[PDB]
Design a protein around this ligand. Structure first.
Ligand SMILES: [Mg+2]
Ligand SMILES: [Mg+2]
Ligand SMILES: [Mg+2]
Ligand SMILES: [Mg+2]
Ligand SMILES: [Mg+2]
Ligand SMILES: [Mg+2]
Ligand SMILES: [Mg+2]
Ligand SMILES: [Mg+2]
Ligand SMILES: [Mg+2]
Ligand SMILES: [Mg+2]
Ligand SMILES: [Mg+2]
Lengths: 117, 56, 151
RNA sequence: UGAGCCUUGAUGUGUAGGAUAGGUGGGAGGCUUUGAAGUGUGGACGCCAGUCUGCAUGGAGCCGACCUUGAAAUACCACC
RNA sequence: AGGCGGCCCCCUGGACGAAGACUGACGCUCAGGUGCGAAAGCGUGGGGAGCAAACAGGAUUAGAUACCCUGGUAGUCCACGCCGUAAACGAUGUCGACUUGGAGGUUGUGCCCUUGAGGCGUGGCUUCCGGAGCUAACGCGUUAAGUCGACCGCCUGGGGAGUACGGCCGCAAGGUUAAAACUCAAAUGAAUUGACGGGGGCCCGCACAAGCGGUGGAGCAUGUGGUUUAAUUCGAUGCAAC
RNA sequence: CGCGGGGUGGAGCAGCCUGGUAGCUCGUCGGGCUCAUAACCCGAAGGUCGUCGGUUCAAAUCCGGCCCCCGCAACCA
């Protein structure tokens, strides 16, 4: 049902949690998986291996939709920056676009203050 | 850094290229800079320090 | 040592078969220095396993060890306040030793009437993967697996 | 895009086991040119065993108590 | 000066320079006086995304009115005003003059055939190292803290106290000017040897790790302490007394 | 009293939803681990599955009475 040949794969690589989300060419989701939603908390949450695992899980989930070719959207810097992509490659999706959509502000919005440790 | 995969090219190589592109951009560094707000004074001080370091 | 990396002392093989591993096992078993008793116990254990399995005394020893030895072992790093118990690749030299130690511990724990008999039983359990040492190995592996995340 | 229903097609692994046996009554043969074995398979389900077909190819056979089972043929079936 | 960074237009200040032309001391500083003056704040009116005092909850914590997280009002933004303080700091008043230098950078400009980005030199502007010199040294150092001149401003031990009281200014917050009594023998400044750092780098020890056995729990030996005794000889007291 | 849903390890919730089937959140102890309370895993004790009978090979799972908790509207001399 509602099968697709190729779709976008958003990886939200952050300092806290890596998010893997597989969506349509235009922007309609099918299945997502998170490193925190794989059975990992705190120190295990922000991890390349965990990210990889999450990616694998996502791939497993989306295999019902008949996806063959793949494109990946990269958002933010995290521990799972390339590990995630490696995972999906291993899972067997013929990667075409390694898109980077990192949210760099052009000096507008005020950031929060420094963490004094 | 929007990166496309060429024909007759491995995945690892593509990944490496992407990494290089990222490095060239300095996106991660920018994010780090913007992670927490910097007071202008502090930034200026840092710049001065960097300049000092440059002189060897 | 902070400075010294030295080649370890030569340990002579077992009198009955010709095995360094067996000797090492005996040493591990032995405390206070009573080697001849320990050796005898080991021999007895081997005999019972042979009587049970109907196989070679050393080969059986080996596969039991194989069944109880892990590939990955956790190690504390202590960088922050929270535990950073990083898993590390274990060398084939000390892995064996660790397995032997585990076996010994299991034997100690066991409540059969002869110590030789106890360890024979442990060996048997290892062969059929159901004993205490094997269980310990399993969770060690699980612990490593959980935190294999770190490098 | 939900609600039923006259209706017509799917659906039923306790382990014994030919393997995805719901039961209760009529039967030892029903089906076939309102086209039988075997072959490429689309889509499904799925216990991954296999289970229901759509369409093409092929043109004269698959099944039945079987050995099993607390229950027997999906050899024909109605009440559902 | 405070400051000011998307872009584009309008209005406009100033600087700097090059050839030249002209005025002819028109110069300098500045008590009082006037204007400008980050931030926060204050005032009406707006505007309000984020951020974020206060504030709330969570943690953390011995406690946690904090640091940390989630949130979140004033404020941060404009409009015309007030405020008039900042470590407004080059901690160096302002101007003018002179004295071996370099590496540069920045911003121009004029000749020589630019015979090529370039070359000759040669003027303005800013940064670092540093000679003479100077200083308490640190250091500053043709942008002086050097050698002189002018002119001001301000200091005269610390604290009390840049506070009181009074004035003047302020819507208010307060600002400004500015004491005294009493009190202390120091108060500092630079640098030096040290030590120390929950600074940095190096190395090392059974220091950790990895391991092997303990003690600590029991009884016994012993020694101390504590209590007790007529007397419990006295000393030993982190390691380095038991 | 009429009707509807529930009695599930120490507690609550899935398994009923059309027989072939004890899982979830903790709680408790032990082990590993940390300076650790904790976080985290491994292992275990802990349930006439309201009660009882019936159909059946097979029920906590279908039904019947009975008991308890709740919800429901209802009148209440
Ligand atoms: Mg004249
Ligand atoms: Mg302001
Ligand atoms: Mg205001
Ligand atoms: Mg905050
Ligand atoms: Mg609080
Ligand atoms: Mg002042
Ligand atoms: Mg300033
Ligand atoms: Mg001053
Ligand atoms: Mg200098
Ligand atoms: Mg005052
Ligand atoms: Mg003791």
């Amino acid at each position: 049902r509602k099968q697709v040949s190729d779709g976008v794969a958003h990886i939200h690589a952050s300092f806290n949690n890596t998010i893997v989300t597989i969506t349509d060419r235009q922007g309609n989701a099918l299945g997502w998986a998170t490193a925190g939603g794989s059975g990992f908390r705190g120190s295990r949450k922000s991890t390349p291996f965990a990210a990889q695992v999450a990616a694998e899980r996502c791939a497993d989930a989306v295999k019902e939709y008949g996806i063959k070719n793949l494109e990946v959207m990269v958002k933010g810097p995290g521990p799972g920056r390339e590990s995630t992509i490696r995972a999906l490659n291993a899972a067997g999706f013929r990667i075409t676009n390694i898109t980077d959509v990192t949210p760099i502000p052009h000096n507008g919005c005020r950031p929060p203050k420094k963490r004094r440790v | 850094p929007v990166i496309k995969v060429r024909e007759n090219e491995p995945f690892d190589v593509a990944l490496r290229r992407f990494k290089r592109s990222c490095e060239k951009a300095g996106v991660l560094a920018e994010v780090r800079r913007r992670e927490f707000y910097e007071k202008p004074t502090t930034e200026r001080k840092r710049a001065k320090a960097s300049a000092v370091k440059r002189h060897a | 040592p902070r400075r010294r990396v030295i080649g370890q002392r030569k340990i002579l093989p077992d009198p009955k078969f010709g095995s360094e591993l067996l000797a090492k096992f005996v040493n591990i078993l032995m405390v206070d220095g009573k080697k001849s008793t320990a050796e005898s116990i080991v021999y007895s254990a081997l005999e019972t396993l042979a009587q049970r399995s109907g196989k070679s005394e050393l080969e059986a020893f080996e596969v039991a060890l194989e069944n109880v030895r892990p590939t990955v072992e956790v190690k504390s790093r202590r960088v922050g306040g929270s535990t950073y118990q990083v898993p590390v690749e274990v060398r084939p030299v000390r892995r064996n030793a660790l397995a032997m130690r585990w076996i010994v511990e299991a034997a100690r724990k066991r409540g059969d009437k002869s110590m030789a008999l106890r360890l024979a039983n442990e060996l048997s359990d290892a062969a059929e993967n159901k004993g205490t040492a094997v269980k310990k190995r399993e969770d060690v592996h699980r612990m490593a697996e959980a935190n294999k995340a770190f490098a």
